[PDB]
Structure formats: C-alpha cells, structure tokens
Design a protein around this ligand. Structure first.
Ligand code: THP
Ligand code: CA
Length: 129
C-alpha cells in the first residue's frame, strides 16, 4: 500500500477524522477498528486519544487498502499515520478500539492490529479492564 499526503481539518471522534485529501474535505473512517461512540464508556477517552494524535502531528498521511476506498456514507476508508505512527494500531494497542469490521480485500493490516489487541487485552487496558 502507499502513503499519501493529507492535512487535518478537524478531529471528530475515536475512529473518524476530517481531513483534506487531494484538496477536498473528506471524513475518514479508520479501517479495521471500532472505537466506542462518544456517549459510551471509553468514548471520550478514544476521541481524546485520536484528537491528540492527529492534532500534534506535523505530518498526516493516509493509506488506502486494496478494496473499497469509500463506504456507504461517503467516508474514506484508510490507515491514517501521524508522524509515521498508525492511529488505527495505536488505538487498538491502548485498548481504546477493538479490531472490527474486517471485510475481505480491505484487511492488509489485520495481523498487525490483532497483535496489538492481544497485547492490550493481556494488559487489561481500558476496554479490556
Ligand atoms: C469501518 C467500516 C465501516 N463500515 C460501515 C459498516 C457499518 O454500517 P451500519 O452503519 O449500517 O452499522 C458502519 C459502522 O461504522 P461506525 O462504527 O462508524 O458506525 O460503517 C463499512 O462499510 N466499512 C468499513 O470498513
Ligand atoms: Ca465507532
């Protein structure tokens, strides 16, 4: 897969973010993860974790997988990198997202992310506490 440039417009929640991509504002949905909604337990902590990660980044990059690049709501589906660190993985590693929504074809980083989740569980972090 290939990393492409983008700029932060606005943090939304734990697993969605508004970015400018090829000069167009787009809501991005993080592949392969599910954060709780803001109105659920660990929702606010997830939102804050993603927000800090993208807001502190000097460089945001997106990486589409081999499959569907936009979902039924028009959100871009991507792995999003903040100064070279994947937000998707970082969520999971901290137990603020579960590996989820794993659809054939858009599953390149599945193994990396399940590995993170297994560690987060072993540590009983957040959701796993
Ligand atoms: C992450 C992801 C979500 N979705 C859709 C499936 C779910 O449909 P429904 O809205 O019908 O449940 C929804 C969950 O996204 P949220 O977790 O952001 O709600 O987003 C995809 O189609 N592909 C994906 O890769
Ligand atoms: Ca969610």
């Amino acid at each position: 897969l290939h990393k492409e440039p983008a700029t932060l417009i606005k943090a939304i929640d734990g697993d969605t973010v508004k970015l400018m991509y090829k000069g167009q504002p787009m809501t991005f949905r993080l592949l392969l993860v599910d954060t709780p909604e803001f109105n659920e337990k660990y929702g606010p902590e997830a939102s804050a974790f993603t927000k800090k990660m993208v807001e502190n980044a000097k460089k945001i990059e997106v990486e589409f997988d081999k499959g569907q690049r936009t979902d039924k709501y028009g959100r871009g589906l991507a792995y999003i990198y903040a100064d070279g660190k994947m937000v998707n993985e970082a969520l999971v590693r901290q137990g603020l997202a579960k590996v989820a929504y794993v659809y054939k074809g858009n599953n390149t980083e599945e193994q990396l992310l399940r590995k993170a989740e297994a560690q987060a569980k072993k540590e009983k972090l957040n959701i796993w506490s």
